[PDB]
Amino acid sequence: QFTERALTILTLAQKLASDHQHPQLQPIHILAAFIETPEDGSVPYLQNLIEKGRYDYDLFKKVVNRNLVRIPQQQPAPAEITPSYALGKVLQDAAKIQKQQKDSFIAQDHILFALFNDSSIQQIFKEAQVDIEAIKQQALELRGNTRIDSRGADTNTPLEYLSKYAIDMTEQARQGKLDPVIGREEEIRSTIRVLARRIKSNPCLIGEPGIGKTAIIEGVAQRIIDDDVPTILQGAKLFSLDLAALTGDFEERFKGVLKEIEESKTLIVLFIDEIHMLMGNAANILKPALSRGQLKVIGATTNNEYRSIVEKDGAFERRFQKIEVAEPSVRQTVAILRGLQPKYEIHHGVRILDSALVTAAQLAKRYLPYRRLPDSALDLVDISCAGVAVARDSKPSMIQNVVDSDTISETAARLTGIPVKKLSESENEKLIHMERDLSSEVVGQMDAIKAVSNAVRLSRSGLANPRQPASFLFLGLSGSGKTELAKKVAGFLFNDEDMMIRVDCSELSEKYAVSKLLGTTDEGGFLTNQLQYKPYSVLLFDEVEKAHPDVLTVMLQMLDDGRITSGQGKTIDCSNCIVIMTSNLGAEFINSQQGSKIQESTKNLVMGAVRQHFRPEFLNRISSIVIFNKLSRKAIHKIVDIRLKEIEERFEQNDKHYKLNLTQEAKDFLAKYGYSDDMGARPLNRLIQNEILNKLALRILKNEIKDKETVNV
């Protein structure tokens, strides 16, 4: 039976016979119904079955221009009020070729197919078109199996189906639309390598989003239109799915392409983005036909996405090769950064200095966890582009070239902040002065600090395995810098308080591999999240001495490789991560520091304890273990003052401008009552406000303090 778009074809010739008020349904109505507009946009028109197959229709278009208009006048009601079986035998008569394309019901050409019998101007110059086979011929010769039922423009587009969802950038290549690619070359060649196998030509590309996985396809196709596509491969061209709404459940449409491209004679390729569809319920789609062994197909993913369906399946695996896409090098970035460098600055009507370009690639490489310098650099760039180009655009211009700095800096400032660190000194002088920097926090443990400052350089220069943590287990008490130190650490290192990340073993006696994010069975993402939020980071564990067989055993991986697996299966870099461990074990021996005990002696004395509490392997990834020992007034009162230093931070700083007085006795009193042997004046610290702030807040309440009015005890 007819297509609904044949009905829509019918609609037009009728709508013609409606608007142009033809009193009956005649042979020649359906050409205007056929022709969309003078375009070949109708499968009947020019690229059509007709012109190329046997004779040009544009002629029989050019002439029927009148035939359309030679219809007589009507009055309002009667126009085309009849089905006109003279024409309307095609209601039955069109059933000729409907199935013979291996189909269901009648189509545009196919109703027309019976029209060469029915609808035609068969005359001295016979206007009847492609004659015996030629229609059916060209019905097959153009697409063919051109329609099924009612769905999609009846003999849509110049050809048939696909081309709606068929997307080819070899065009855009040969159209120049495509970005040149870099450095995925033999990677492509490996993808290319995928392609020869009678067993599996079908790749899958594992790796981070935004890495270029689709942009990969460029060079794929680019080298294809370069005819770096090899012999077998040359015949194919670019095609890949642009996921269409099915518009009940129309995957038949998406089934449509399948044999279509299958019939299409290997002229193209199939690439598939990411969800290679696992529906929660459509399940096998194309999969068996996909499993047939024709139908070249490309996969791409990152780990867990790959881990989604195929782990069930394995047939994808059975039907594919998975191929990791390595996050490209910074210079891979830097290089292909320059690729659209001219572009985006011209996109943004500006100029660039590679100075920034590398600089972001330098800097930003660390600082966007989620997105990828494989893009984010550029993403910074467009970002870098605009606002300054905006500072050009409506008015805020002479700056056209990207500044190095602000384009990173200000944007980094836009991105995060505290440029001054991110501004100049990179990787290095921080180190030399790190200790003397860190010497701020609490004196003593300086060696450890040095060792830290050492180990962080062990953490650098890649001498120590660039895949490996920085392994730090600390001894002391509350107040002692397991208490503290991390605060400085990333604040020094990552310039943050929160790259420091809190973990308590007391929480974890048994199963926390459960809440580590186990394999979903209810989402334990925390640890993962902790990095998955925060990749360049500092890892504080608490009660580490009580670390239980569970938590410690992943500590091993944490100890290992500078990488962290998940329960969902993702592994996650620990290398750029810093690990921090509360250990109070030798608290005895720590307490013995009353004797100001020979450290190593008491360390050795301690060691056995910790040596007991931990298998060596643990101990033997540990990059150091140190006490946080006895405190000197020298230390103390300064450390005291340290908070006293920063009192202002909101107060005299971001609020009050309060002009500070302290009596040294009080400054000592601080130590005096306040310093706790075991816990320090860290308890008094909590107290401080009481004896300090409220004491002032009192005056604040009073107003005996006006700004700078200050009286203390």
Partner 1 sequence: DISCAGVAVARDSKPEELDSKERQLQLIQVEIKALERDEDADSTTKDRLKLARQKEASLQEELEPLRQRYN
Find out whether 158 is annotated in a ligand binding site. Answer: no
Find out whether 411 is annotated in a ligand binding site. Answer: no
CA 595 to chain centre: 57
Find out whether 477 is annotated in a ligand binding site. Answer: yes
CA–CA gap between residue 574 and residue 581 (Å, rounded): 15
Find out whether 299 is annotated in a ligand binding site. Answer: no
Looking from the CA of 127 toward its CB, the CA atoms found within 13 Å total: 15
Tokens 């035939």 belong to 67
Q: In terms of Cα–Cα distance, which of 37, 35, 33, 36 is closest to 50?
A: 35
Does residue 539 interact with its own copies by CB under 8 A? no
Question: Toward partner 1, which CB reaches closer, 341 or 599?
Answer: 341
Two tokens, residue 632: 């000197």
Does residue 123 interact with its own copies by CB under 8 A? no
Question: Toward ligand ATP, which CB reaches closer, 112 or 360?
Answer: 360
Question: Toward its own copies, which CB reaches closer, 131 or 707?
Answer: 131
Whether the Cβ atoms of residue 16 and residue 74 lie closer than 8 Å to each other: no
Residues that bind ligand ATP (CB under 6 A): 179, 181-182, 184, 209-215, 218, 273-274, 336, 339, 374-375, 441-442, 478-479, 481-485, 639, 642-643, 680, 682, 685
- Beta strand pairing call for 577-583 and 571-573: unpaired
Does residue 291 interact with its own copies by CB under 8 A? no
H or E segment to which residue 333 belongs: helix 330-347
In single-letter form, the type of residue at position 238 comes to: L
Find out whether 207 is annotated in a ligand binding site. Answer: yes
Q: After which residues does a break in the chain occur, C–N more than 2.5 Å?
A: 247, 281, 396, 521
Find out whether 483 is annotated in a ligand binding site. Answer: yes
Residues 57-96 vs its own copies: string with x where CB under 8 A? -xx--x--x--xx----------------------x--xx
**Residues 487, 493, 498, CA angle at the centre, nearest 5°?**
45
* Residue 338 binding result from partner 1, its own copies, ligand ATP, none, given CB thresholds of 5 to 8 Å by partner type: partner 1
**Other CB atoms closer than 10 Å to residue 279's CB: what's the count?**
12
Find out whether 213 is annotated in a ligand binding site. Answer: yes
**Residues 130-159 within binding reach of its own copies (CB under 8 A):** 132, 136-138, 145, 148
- CB burial of residue 249 (10 Å; 0-12, 13-18, 19+): exposed
**Residues 39-58 within binding reach of its own copies (CB under 8 A):** 46, 52-56, 58
Does residue 101 interact with its own copies by CB under 8 A? yes
Does residue 386 interact with its own copies by CB under 8 A? yes
Find out whether 124 is annotated in a ligand binding site. Answer: no
Number of residues assigned to the chain: 713
Could you please report the per-residue DSSP string of 74-132? --TTTTT-S--HHHHTHHHHTHHHHTTTT-SS--HHHHHHHHTTSSSB-SSS-B--STT
What are the strands of the beta sheet with 500-501, ordered from one edge? Answer: 500-501, 537-541, 577-583, 472-475, 624-626
Whether the Cβ atoms of residue 547 and residue 583 lie closer than 8 Å to each other: no
Find out whether 210 is annotated in a ligand binding site. Answer: yes
268: alpha, beta or left? (left if phi > 0; alpha if psi -120 to 50) = beta
Does residue 582 interact with partner 1 by CB under 8 A? no
* Residue 404 binding result from its own copies, ligand ATP, partner 1, none, given CB thresholds of 5 to 8 Å by partner type: none
**Other CB atoms closer than 10 Å to residue 462's CB: what's the count?**
11
Residues 178, 194, 539, 639: which binds partner 1 (CB under 8 A)? 194
* Residue 212 binding result from ligand ATP, partner 1, its own copies, none, given CB thresholds of 5 to 8 Å by partner type: ligand ATP
Find out whether 481 is annotated in a ligand binding site. Answer: yes
Find the shortest distance in angstroms from Cβ 19 to its own copies.
5
Q: In terms of Cα–Cα distance, which of 84, 51, 145 is closest to 34?
A: 51
Find out whether 521 is annotated in a ligand binding site. Answer: no
Does residue 193 interact with partner 1 by CB under 8 A? yes
Residues 36, 56, 228, 393: which binds partner 1 (CB under 8 A)? 228
Residues 393-432 vs its own copies: string with x where CB under 8 A? xx--------------------------------------
- List Cα–Cα distances, 273 to 200, 219, 229, 483, 557, in angstroms: 18, 16, 21, 48, 32
Whether the Cβ atoms of residue 585 and residue 547 lie closer than 8 Å to each other: no
CA–CA gap between residue 210 and residue 111 (Å, rounded): 48
Does residue 232 interact with partner 1 by CB under 8 A? yes
Find the shortest distance in angstroms from Cβ 446 to ligand ATP.
11
Does residue 100 interact with its own copies by CB under 8 A? yes
Residues 167, 383, 423, 666: which binds its own copies (CB under 8 A)? 383
Does residue 699 interact with partner 1 by CB under 8 A? no
Find out whether 38 is annotated in a ligand binding site. Answer: no
- Beta strand pairing call for 563-565 and 571-573: antiparallel
Q: What is the dihedral of CA 396, 398, 403, 409, to 10 degrees?
A: -20
Question: Toward its own copies, which CB reaches closer, 132 or 398?
Answer: 132
Residues 389, 438, 579, 631: which binds its own copies (CB under 8 A)? 389
Question: Toward ligand ATP, which CB reaches closer, 13 or 325?
Answer: 325
* Residue 639 binding result from ligand ATP, its own copies, partner 1, none, given CB thresholds of 5 to 8 Å by partner type: ligand ATP
Whether the Cβ atoms of residue 38 and residue 50 lie closer than 8 Å to each other: no
Find out whether 102 is annotated in a ligand binding site. Answer: no
Find the shortest distance in angstroms from Cβ 99 to its own copies.
1
Residues annotated in the binding site for ATP, as ranges?
Answer: 207-214, 476-483
Q: Which residues bind partner 1 (CB under 8 A)?
A: 182, 185-186, 189, 192-199, 223, 227-233, 335, 338, 341, 351, 353-355, 401
Enumerate binding residues for its own copies (CB under 8 A): 19-20, 37-38, 46, 52-56, 58-59, 62, 65, 68-69, 92, 95-104, 132, 136-138, 145, 148, 189, 192-196, 347-348, 382-383, 385-387, 389-390, 393-394
